[PDB]
Design a binder for this molecule. Structure first.
Ligand SMILES: *[C@@H]1O[C@H](CO)[C@@H](O[C@@H]2O[C@H](CO)[C@@H](O)[C@H](O)[C@@H]2O)[C@H](O)[C@H]1NC(C)=O
Ligand code: NAG
Lengths: 48, 48
């Protein structure tokens, strides 16, 4: 519901959701988007 | 730049590239293979 949305807000108001109390399997994050930039800084995307 | 040898009227599509791999490519590895990337949980073998 952060990748299935319809009105990702403009950058002047960057919508900020909070994700807590959950199990984060980023494989679904890998399915809703044919990526163009997965640049991760603090963590390695393979080890997430 | 070489738009004189990779171009013609009515177009050309000889070249190819891979957006869909089961994992990353380790340094200096070729992965020439035509396998349909899985989605969901289907053993699907076909386009669409
Ligand atoms: C950012 O956009 C998200 C997706 O539209 C919002 O999440 C949902 O918002 C709906 C209301 O539009 C809620 O009913 C739902 O429970 C879920 O929270 C999110 O609220 C929004 N955040 C901000 C700060 O605008
Ligand atoms: C958004 O949700 C609809 C609901 O059926 C789904 O079909 C679609 O694939 C989703 N798209 C993204 C980008 O999440």
């Amino acid at each position: 519901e952060v990748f299935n949305a319809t009105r990702f807000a403009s950058v002047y108001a960057w919508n900020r959701t909070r994700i807590s109390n959950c199990v984060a399997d980023y494989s679904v994050l890998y399915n809703f988007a044919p990526f163009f930039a997965f640049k991760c800084y603090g963590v390695s995307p393979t080890k997430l | 730049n070489s738009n004189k040898l990779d171009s013609k009227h009515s177009g050309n599509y000889d070249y190819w590239y891979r957006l869909f791999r089961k994992s990353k490519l380790k340094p200096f590895e070729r992965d020439i293979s035509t396998e349909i990337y899985q989605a969901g949980n289907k053993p699907c073998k076909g386009k669409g």
